[PDB]
Every structure is written in C-alpha cells, then in structure tokens.
C-alpha cells in the first residue's frame, strides 16, 4: 500500500496501523495506552497518539486506524501537538509529584518529557485510598490513567475474569470482585497486570517501602526459565548483589510473555537461609558427623564404591537418578555407571508417572513424544481433555486454550468426575465413576465405524490391524455402557460426531489416567482417535499429553533408563552394544536393569549394596513407609547429593554440595519437544559447586579419566551419538535461544509435527492394539 506521510510517498505492509509505520520509519510518537507487545489489542482511550488526515474534520488515532490508499497522514502540525500536550497536562494535573512517588522512572513520565511537559495548570481531584491486602502486590491506586491494560491482561490473555471498571466517568476506577480488597479476591498472582500498568500504581512489593515510593533500580538482568513446570516459561531475573528479587517474561516462542505465580514470586528456596555448603556425614541444622573437606569425603565415595564392587560384584551395585534440574549431567550420571560399574542398573523415579503412555506410544508408533505442540491450538477447531487440571499445574496452556475459545470459538469437551474451573468456559462436562473411562472410550471408538463415518483412506495404508479387531468392536456398542460409566448415549453419539466430523482436533490428559494400574489399557484405545479419523500429522491436529516436571523428556530421551541407552536404543540388542563401545571403550552388560520398585523390593532382604543417589527425595515419593525407612536401613554404604538435608538420607554416610538451579549453563527441554538453553546469574554460597564437576572428579577418583571439560563440550559429546539433534550446536542454542530437535536443516525454523508424511517406524504404519475391558 502506498500513502503519503509527513510529506513523503512511503509504502506500508498490511495490518500496519500508522503507529507501526512511523516506528519502522523512525518518527516515534507517544501512545501510553497502546502496548505494542504481541498479545494485546488497542482500544483508543488515552487519545495521545492522534494525527491529522486530509478529508476528516475531527482528529483521529494512530493505534486503531490503517493507511488505506490515497490517504495522507500528518503529525508535525499544530492541532495534534496542542491536543497531546493538553491531554498530558490533564493527566499530570491529576497525578502526584514525580520527584518521589511510585515508579518515578516510568513510561508515563517519559512520554511526558517527550511532549515537553513538567507541571500542569489544572487542579487536583482528592482521589481514593490504597489497599495492601495482597502480600506481593501493592495497589496504591492514585495514578490510574484509565489505560485498561490491567483488564486486557486479566480479561483477555491470562483469562481469570477478575478485574473490571465498574463505575462512571469521574468515579471510574478498577475494582476486583465486588469491590473487595483483592487480598482474598480471585486474583491468582498471575503477574500479567503488574508489568502492564505503566504508572507505579499496580506495582509489586520489593520495589518500594512503607511511604510507598520506588527505592531501587535494576542492579542487572539475566534471561532464563522457570524450574517448576514443563513448559519452559522464559524469564528475565531481576537481581541485586547477592539477592534475587522479581522477574518479567520475554518474547519466548513457548511462553509469549505470560507466567504464573512462580514466574513472579515464590523462589525464596534458592537464597533460603537454612542450606548446605559442606559434607555433613534429626533437626534441620546439621549436628552430627560433620567434617568440612573435599578430598576425604570423596575418597570415602570412590574407594568405597570401588572396593565394595570388587568384593561383592557389579550387579550387587545399584543407582537411582534425577532430572529435576539438568540434562547433560544425566548423560554422565549414566555413562559413569555403565563404565565404572559395568552395569545397566540405572533408574528414574520421575519417569514412573507417565510410563504407560510412552509404552503404548512406542508400541503403536515407535515414539514417546507428544505429537505436536500445545501452542498450536489456535488454528484448530476442537479440543478434548481428560484427567487433568491445567490451570493449576500447567496454567499457561490452560489460558492458551481459554484464548482459543474466546477468539475462534473452537469448542472443547471435558471428562472428569469432579467439577473444574474451566467448566465455565467448557462446552460440556462428563462426570463418571473412576476406573470406567475406557467404556465410553470404546463407545466413542466404535460409534464411528458402526455407523460408517470413518476416513477409510487414512486407515487404508497408514494404520494396520484395522480389520482383525472388528470382531470385538462390532461386538461392542456405544449404547450399553450407561450404568457402567454414568452417562447417556445421545451425548456420546454427539461427541463422536463432533470429533470425527470436525476439521481438526486434539486430546490432552495427564497422570490422572496413567495413575491407575492399567492406565495403559486406557491409552491403549485412546491412541487411535486421530489415527482412525485421519486428523493427525497435519496442522492443528495431533495428540499431546502432559508431564509434571521440567525436562523429564530431556532425561529419559538421553539414556537414564534401566533398559535402554540414549535416543531409545535398547540394551538387549546387540549392535547397540557394538557401536557405543567405539566411544566409551568398554564391555557392557546386555541383561536389563532392575526397575525402580523392582530394585527397591529386591534389596529388601536382597543383595544390592549401596548406590549413588541424586536429585531426589525417594523416601517420600512412591512408597508410603515400608521402602523409606527399612529401604536404606539395611543398606551398607550410602550416598546423597541433595541440595538440602531432606527427610531422605538422614543416615546417608556422605554428602556433596548440590548447586541450585539458577547457576548454570547447558540445555533443558520441555514437554513440547523443544530444548531451552540457560545461563547463570549468581554463584552459590560456601565452597559448593556444580555437578558436572562433582561427577568428573569422582570418575577420575574411580579410574575413568574423562577430562572432557565443561558442559559446552558435554553437549557435543552427547549429540555425536544421538541423531535426534543431528543438526544442532550450542552456538545457535544461545543465539535464537531455544529450538526443538526433530529439525533437519541448519537455517530453518524446525520440523514440529510427528508423522507429516509417514511414521518413522520400520513398516511406515502403526499396529492398532486390541483394547479390551480387562479388569
């Protein structure tokens, strides 16, 4: 589009409201009420971005209009400047003294200094008081410019339906539910309105004091991510010398500038006073067998393990693991075992939950990765969900879904006994007694084929077993399971029509289903909805369960498993044990390891001797009491590398100073197939250190002689084997930040959808599995 501007004949792209054209061109002008960051929407209230155009008689706006053909805009004139200056004069007239107030170095005062205004000539208004009911925030609301961004953040993006302007013009204010103090309001501490209010009214704590006023600037800044969920919410940590304060979101392709309570607050664990800095081998403060040292308590690990190996054997050893806070360590936390102990007795107390899922996924497709991402539910048309509560444990995705509901109207469905928050936004709600989902699941399974509304073509050459099952299937029916599940049939006829007829669809769930004994048998059927209908492997289609940790993918995809080395190349195979050794130069053990509960119940009156624990509180995770106290009691030589003196390893005969999260580089992954880089902020206290040094030193003390160096080379030595990253390097994992592994080309965004043209399985097809009611 061609249109004149300030005396030029310039061009503009489409959807480029005048403001953006000026910015791109270098003629910045004030907005105040228009947050250009992706995610928001303009409203045109402040009227500070006004311009002139030949043809109209009333001035216009620059954030809400568009430069159609022939038009010509004007900013360097008189009317517009006078109007802007007058608006700013009014605002600063109803404003406090910027000398000492809330956020003196803010957006409003900057845009004022641009229009050359310091004071005003109008009087004040004698406004209202403040409320500090909520601990983190501080609403000293005497600087409200009525910019309505609080709302577009709490009523349009991080949807929780709390804020709203509930009065008339002069008395117009912002209020929480029923004019309540917001200390017990529906606010969930979702800090998307705290970084949108330009003025310091809607401001957090830690940036001001009793006589509410700014008291600090950013000492420094660092861009990182959150070690609490499995989404990879980026962050920019606000620091002061040996102090961390508060963070904001960044334009991360996974988060998109929106966090939860923990992206803002709740990290008092890192700098938590009561901590550990030296070996210490009951009350919290260490009081027994403490001997600060770094060559004694490492002899007492290397020599101990080596000698007990010699005297009792290799299989007599065992080892737990962890993935809470690192990836590259696991590569080594397992290489160490496989080399010095010559034994595949690894385990993973975090992969326990969602095992059945990946079991079925590799049975049917030879993979365990959620088909396609969750941030792609905005081009779809339908949703499915069962056994979960995203808003709580995976909120960001929940609000993505809410936004998709709002904008595009794409319906969803629910499957849960109790009532959930999303109900309000939910198109339906299907309660049922537990351990019975599979019934209505088969109903939906066979509703399609029995009526005859399936997509034969996709089932023609892309999924085998389509005919051998039909005996039980046509034997089954979607009308019989009412008293067995607790629903009516027409609902199910509908739901299935909806899915199969829908242009696209997805399904979500979590540990709620796979928690049951035969949750496998649940997914054993859920697998094929997208496959039997075809709505898979294409934009907006796929299957995508969720995980409850940071990089469990990154751990259990790079060789922390009792039956397989990284990138899912099992041990029982032969060639696996013939090519890995050109790198590790060792003789391995083909027989599998003893799984977590297997090894635990084994050692109980068993034969294993000691282990090398790490990043876990096993004493209180899976087993209630029997395998917590008596578990390690009979053990002889023990190790614990925990940050704190957690309840577990109360008698762990040696300890090391686990480094916290916020201090490291490396690589992390999410439940989205993406790998996120990190970066350190603050060194730890005491003589503590990281783990990629602990394990290096211990390998050396155990006659391994790796001497690789730093993680920036562990990455390469871990990728040289795993083709999943066949085109990746730390360089572009720093620049461009995060990426996902299934990509093929170097200078391309990525390949982010399973089965776009064919399964990566030997046959190219799946093996649809017999799904029976097998209690």
């Amino acid at each position: 589009i061609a249109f004149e501007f300030d005396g030029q004949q310039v061009e503009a792209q489409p959807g480029e409201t005048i403001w953006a054209v000026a910015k791109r061109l270098g003629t910045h002008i004030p907005h105040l009420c228009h947050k250009p960051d992706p995610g928001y929407r303009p409203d045109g209230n402040c009227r500070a971005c006004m311009v002139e155009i030949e043809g109209e008689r009333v001035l216009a706006a620059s954030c809400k209009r568009t430069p159609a053909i022939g038009m010509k805009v004007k900013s360097a004139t008189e009317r517009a400047t006078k109007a802007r200056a007058m608006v700013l004069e009014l605002l600063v007239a109803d404003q406090p003294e910027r000398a000492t107030s809330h956020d003196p170095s803010s957006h409003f005062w900057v845009q004022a200094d641009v229009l050359d205004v310091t004071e005003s000539r109008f009087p004040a208004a004698e406004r209202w008081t403040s409320d500090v009911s909520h601990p983190a925030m501080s609403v000293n609301l005497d600087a409200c410019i009525q910019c309505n961004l609080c709302v577009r953040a709490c009523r349009e993006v991080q949807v929780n339906d709390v804020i709203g302007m509930a009065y008339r013009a002069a008395g117009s204010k912002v209020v929480f539910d029923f004019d309540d103090p917001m200390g017990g309001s529906t606010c969930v501490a979702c800090g998307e309105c705290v970084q949108a209010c330009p003025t310091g009214a809607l401001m957090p704590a830690a940036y001001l004091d009793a006589n509410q006023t700014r008291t600090v600037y950013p000492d420094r800044e660092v861009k990182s991510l959150c070690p609490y969920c499995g989404v990879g919410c980026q962050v920019s940590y606000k620091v002061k010398d040996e102090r961390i304060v508060y963070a904001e979101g960044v334009n991360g392709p996974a988060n998109q500038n929106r966090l939860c309570v923990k992206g803002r607050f709740g990290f008092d664990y890192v700098h938590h006073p009561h901590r550990l800095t030296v070996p210490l081998i009951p009350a919290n403060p260490w009081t027994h067998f403490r001997e600060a040292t770094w060559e004694e308590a490492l002899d007492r690990a290397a020599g101990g393990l080596k000698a007990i190996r010699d005297t009792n054997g290799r299989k007599a050893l065992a080892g737990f693991g962890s993935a809470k806070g690192s990836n590259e360590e696991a590569y080594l936390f397992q290489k160490l075992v496989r080399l010095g102990f010559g034994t595949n007795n690894v385990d993973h107390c975090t992969r326990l939950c969602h095992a059945s899922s990946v079991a079925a996924l590799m049975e049917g497709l030879n993979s365990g990765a959620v088909t396609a991402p969750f941030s792609a539910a905005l081009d779809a048309e339908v949703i499915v969900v069962i056994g979960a509560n995203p808003t709580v444990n995976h909120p960001v995705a929940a609000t993505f879904l809410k936004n998709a509901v709002k904008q595009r109207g794409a319906k969803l469905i629910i499957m849960d006994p109790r009532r959930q928050t999303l109900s309000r936004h939910a198109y339906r709600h299907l309660a049922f007694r537990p351990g019975s989902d599979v019934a209505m699941l088969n109903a939906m399974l066979n509703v399609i084929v029995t009526e005859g509304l399936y997509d034969e073509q996709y089932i023609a050459g892309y999924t085998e077993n389509f005919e051998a099952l039909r005996e039980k299937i046509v034997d089954f029916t979607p009308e019989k399971m009412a008293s067995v599940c607790g629903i009516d049939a027409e609902t199910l006829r509908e739901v299935a029509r909806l899915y199969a007829r829908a242009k696209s669809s997805l399904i979500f769930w979590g540990m709620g289903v796979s928690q049951h004994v035969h949750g496998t048998d649940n997914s054993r059927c859920l697998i094929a909805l997208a496959l039997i209908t075809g709505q898979i492997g294409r934009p907006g289609t796929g299957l995508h369960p969720l995980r409850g940790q940071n990089n469990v993918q990154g751990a259990s995809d790079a060789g922390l498993i009792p039956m397989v080395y990284p990138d899912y190349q099992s041990v029982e195979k032969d060639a696996v044990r013939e090519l890995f050794e050109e790198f590790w130069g060792q003789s391995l053990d083909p027989q599998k390891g003893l799984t977590v509960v297997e090894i635990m119940r084994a050692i109980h009156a068993g034969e294993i001797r000691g282990m090398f624990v790490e990043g876990e509180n096993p004493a209180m995770s899976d087993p209630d009491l029997n395998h917590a106290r008596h578990a390690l009691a009979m053990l002889d030589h023990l190790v614990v590398q925990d940050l704190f003196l957690t309840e577990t390893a109360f008698h762990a005969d040696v300890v090391l100073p686990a480094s916290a999260f916020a201090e490291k580089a490396g690589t992390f992954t999410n439940t989205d197939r993406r790998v996120q880089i990190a970066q350190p902020v603050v060194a730890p206290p005491g003589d503590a250190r990281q783990d990629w040094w602990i394990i290096q030193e211990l390998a050396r003390r155990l006659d391994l002689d790796w001497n690789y160096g730093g993680p920036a080379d562990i990455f390469a030595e871990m990728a040289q084997v795993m083709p999943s990253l066949n085109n990746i390097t730390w360089e572009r994992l720093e620049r461009e930040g995060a990426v996902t592994y299934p990509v093929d080309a170097p200078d391309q965004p990525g390949n982010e959808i399973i089965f776009y043209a064919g399964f990566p399985t030997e046959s190219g097809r799946a093996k649809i599995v017999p799904a029976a009611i097998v209690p």
């Binding site: 109008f122 009523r155 339906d161 013009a169 539910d177």
Partner: protein, 537 residues
C-alpha cells in the same frame, strides 16, 4: 479466596422459572430484582451469575453503570423501599428546584423514605417534574407530595388514548397490508421518501432514503432498532405522541422493517417513561401474529445510550460504551450485523407521506428552507408545550405566533436551541432561521428541536455550570477529554472568574479529540458565552 455461591440460590431459580439465559438478556433480570426487592444485593448477583455461568466482574460492571440499580454488600446499610426524585436540569431548576430539594430533604427524608437528585425526565413543560415511585407530578410542591406519600399513591396513573379498533376505523393498517401484497411495490416508497426530502429527526440531520437503500443493499439476516431515550433536557416530544396515538408509530416501524427484510425488531426507551411502557405492552398483544415479531426493552439512566453504538451494546446486555466511527453502524450492528436506527418521530410521519405524497411536504416551509417539524418550546413563555410549524422559522415568530408570547413580568435576553448540546445565544441573534444546516457557522446547531427562553431575571453562567455538571454526570467514562475536561470545567467555572483562555484551549482539544459526539459538544456553551457575551468579563 473469592465470593462464594451461598445457600441463597433458591430465590433466583424460583423467581426466573422458565426464561432464557443469554448474555444479551441481562438488564431485564436486574430490573426484576430491583422491583421485587427495593435493592440489588451481592448474594443475588452471585446466584444470578453462577446460573448464567459468568464472572462477578461483568455483572458488577453492568449493575452500576446505569445510575438506577442500587447495589449493597454484606456491610453497607439497607436501602428503603419508597424513594422519590427531583429534576436538576436547567428548566426544572429555573422554577425553584434546589430549594425544593433542601426544603423537603429535612421534613420527610426519614428512614422509610428517601430523596435524591435526577437529571431530567421529559417534563420540562410542567416546570418541577417530581416523581414518587413510578408516579410523576406537575407544578410540584411540598403540600402535594405530603398527600401523595401519606397515601400509597406510588403506582402510576394511565390516561385514555386511541386503541386498535378506532385506528382501524380509518386507514387502519391498510397502507401496510398493501405491501405484503403486491398492490404497490417497494421502490415507490423509497422514491417518495427521497424526492420529498425527509431529512431525519434526531440530533444528526441525515436523510432516510439513503439509509434504507444502504441497509437494503447489504446481505444476510438484517435487523433494526428504535431509540426512544430522548434524554436531552429540552426534549419532551416522544411522550406527547406515544401517549396519544402509538399505532401510527407501529405502522411506520413495520413499514420500515418489511422493506429492509428484518425478521425481528427491537425498541429502547427510558425507565422514566413508564406510562408508555404500559400502553405498548397493552397494545402489542392485540397486534396480530403477522410474521414480523417485535420486542421491547428498558433502560436505566445512561443518557450516553441516546447514542447508537451504546444502544447496540446495551441491547447486547453489555456496558453502555460507544464504538469507533471508521467502522460504520449500518455495516456492523446489534449482533455484528446490519441494522437501521430511526427515532419514533421519523416513523410517525411516513403514513402522511405516502397517503398524501411529497408535495404535502413542500408547500409548508416559510423561509427559504423547506420542510415541517415539531418543536419543543419550554422555559418562560405563556403557552409552552410541543409545537408543529414549518421549518426555517425564526425564533421571534415562534414566540409571538405559536407560543402565545413570553410572559407578563419578564423580558427576553437569551435563548438556546439544541438543548444542552447546543449553545446559548442572545436576543440580537433573532433573524436567523432554525434548520439543520444553518447554525453551524455560528458555533451551535439544532439537533433535537429543543428550545428554551431565559429572561433578565435569570443568570447565564449558572446555566452553563448546570449544563457542565450534567455533561459531567452523563459522561460514559472511556475517552480522557470528556472524563477529565468535564471535571476541570466544573472546577474552573466555579471560581468568581475563569480565564477563558485555558478554556478555549481545552475546548479545541475536546472538540478535536473526542471519540463520541458528546465530548464534541460539551464545550459549545462556554465558547458561545465567551464569543457572544463579551459584556460578562
């Protein structure tokens, strides 16, 4: 954690029974609550929302923007059942209102009763305009309200009018039935409406044939609506017609609907016009099931609803906030679909256009201008009330020919057309014709035919102050110029003298940088005073 749905949810399902629960249908529920109970309490809102499955923020935003719904929480004090209101605009205030307020607010302002302010109710003709719970008064005074309260005279009182049969006696819905039949096609109607020059009423000054052609050219399922707010102070026409012969207006509306092919229609008039709210509900049920279904809605305050986009958002059960003008109302409307608005007056005349023609609408104008209009005179005259007269008429002739005169004891100093939106001019501006496109070269205009007359005994600056107070309380609250400029003007105009230069700047700003057509006019009065009253500074 949050406001909880209490056990007090029985009285919300035992009171709505079998009704629809669409967002667009909310205000009726709130009115129902405010009627059955004299207040609207939180618990009830929580129950209502958790029924409609909404959030407390939305219902709270809506239940307080309209100036009538009275809200309370578990902490505040109970509201009484019996209340009254008083007018505070220019006309009702010129006859001794404020003294009335502060005179009866300490005799019968006790617990069981209440007394508050009110902008205007459409009775500028019979001076004070007091109301007692859906019952209005005239020439109000203390010794009359005493008796009106002591006796349970809260209920309204209905006059006589023309029913369906008496109307059917004459032409009686024969012009309409000629359309469902091909006895006369459409194009003729457009052609008469065009060549006859029916420049529409309302404060727009816009033709009608063009609107109808346009809304007829755009596709899909069409709609329509009517604005019966008439909230502008010096405007009391709609009442004198809806209370004498509505069936003519219904004829016109059905005509204007079938042409655009609108399945259903909508209506919107104040809460301060109850008599009509009963006349209609009495008549409609007698109008047969023809094939076009009609509706009827209420409205609580919100003079900003006189605007189109705000009326749309209200009929959508939303907050009364207008929209931007580059995307037009005839392209995207009531439910994101086309719809044509038309004031009841513009409909009331169509029958006389068709049955007689256009020439009957051209042999009327007195001065160069042409047309025929229904003025609304008020203030210190001798025979006030609505008036029909050829457009293009001066004001002196409107005073000494139709209105009988001015008074016996006063004189003529100032006057103001266009009600509040318009300006206040002196006598010397006497030889000017009163039409649509004639006064824009003087600062003011005439949008609603509102007229007022002030004498020497009356002061102008106080009138401008009252108008600015009105515009301050009727502001929607979105655009900054109105929200803050109205305050700064209500303040600057308070002191013994105002600068008028800061005021000129502020007026230029508000007139060039205001979203709605209200802020574009709230500065007309002060500017006209600065210009044509150079002897008051």
């Amino acid at each position: 954690g949050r406001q909880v749905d209490p056990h007090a949810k029985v009285e919300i399902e035992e009171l709505l029974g079998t009704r629809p629960r669409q967002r667009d249908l909310l205000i009726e529920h709130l009115h129902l609550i405010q009627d059955t109970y004299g207040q609207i309490s939180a618990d009830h809102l929580a129950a209502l929302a958790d029924e409609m499955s909404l959030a407390f923020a939305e219902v709270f935003e809506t239940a307080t923007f309209y100036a009538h719904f009275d809200v309370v929480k578990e902490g505040e004090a109970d509201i009484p059942r019996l209340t009254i209101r008083v007018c505070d605009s220019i006309t009702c205030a010129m006859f001794g209102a404020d003294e009335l307020l502060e005179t009866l607010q300490r005799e019968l302002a006790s617990d069981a009763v209440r007394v508050v302010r009110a902008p205007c109710v459409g009775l500028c003709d019979h001076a004070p305009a007091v109301e007692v719970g859906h019952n209005f008064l005239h020439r109000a005074d203390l010794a009359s309200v005493r008796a009106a309260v002591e006796a349970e005279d809260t209920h309204a009182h209905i006059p006589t009018y023309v029913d369906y049969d008496a109307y059917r006696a004459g032409g009686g819905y024969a012009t309409l039935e000629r359309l469902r039949s091909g006895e006369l096609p459409v194009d003729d109607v457009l052609k008469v409406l065009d060549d006859g020059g029916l420049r529409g009423l309302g404060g727009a000054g816009f033709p009608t044939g063009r609107k109808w052609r346009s809304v007829r050219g755009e596709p899909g399922p069409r709609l329509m609506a009517v604005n019966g707010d008439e909230g502008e102070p010096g405007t009391f026409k709609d009442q004198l017609y809806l209370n004498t012969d509505p069936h003519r207006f219904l004829e016109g509306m059905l005509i204007g609907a079938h042409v655009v092919e609108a399945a259903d229609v909508y209506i919107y008039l104040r809460d301060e016009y109850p008599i009509s709210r009963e006349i209609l509900a009495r008549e409609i049920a007698k109008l047969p099931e023809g094939g076009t279904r009609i509706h009827l809605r209420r409205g609580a305050g919100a003079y900003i609803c006189g605007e189109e986009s705000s009326l749309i958002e209200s009929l959508e059960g939303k907050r009364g906030l207008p929209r931007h003008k580059p995307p037009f109302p005839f392209q995207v409307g009531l439910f994101n679909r086309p719809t044509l608005i038309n004031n009841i007056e513009t409909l009331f005349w169509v029958r006389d256009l068709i049955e007689r023609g256009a020439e009957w609408w051209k042999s009327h104008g007195r001065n160069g201008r042409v047309g025929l209009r229904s003025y609304s005179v008020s203030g210190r005259v001798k025979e006030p009330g609505v008036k029909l007269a050829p457009a293009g008429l001066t004001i002196q002739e409107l005073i000494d020919e139709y209105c009988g005169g001015i008074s016996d004891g006063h004189s003529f100093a100032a006057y103001l057309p266009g009600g509040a939106s318009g300006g206040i001019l002196p006598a010397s501006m006497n030889d000017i014709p009163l039409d649509f496109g004639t006064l824009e070269k003087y600062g003011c205009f005439i949008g609603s035919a509102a007229v007022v007359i002030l004498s020497d005994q009356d002061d102008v600056r106080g009138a401008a102050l009252n108008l600015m107070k009105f515009f301050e309380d009727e502001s929607c609250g979105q655009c900054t110029p109105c929200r803050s400029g109205t305050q700064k003007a209500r303040m600057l105009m308070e002191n013994g003298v105002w600068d008028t230069d800061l005021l000129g700047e502020l007026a230029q700003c508000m007139r060039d940088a205001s979203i709605c057509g209200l802020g574009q006019a709230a500065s007309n009065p002060v500017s006209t005073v600065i210009k044509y009253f150079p002897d008051l500074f």
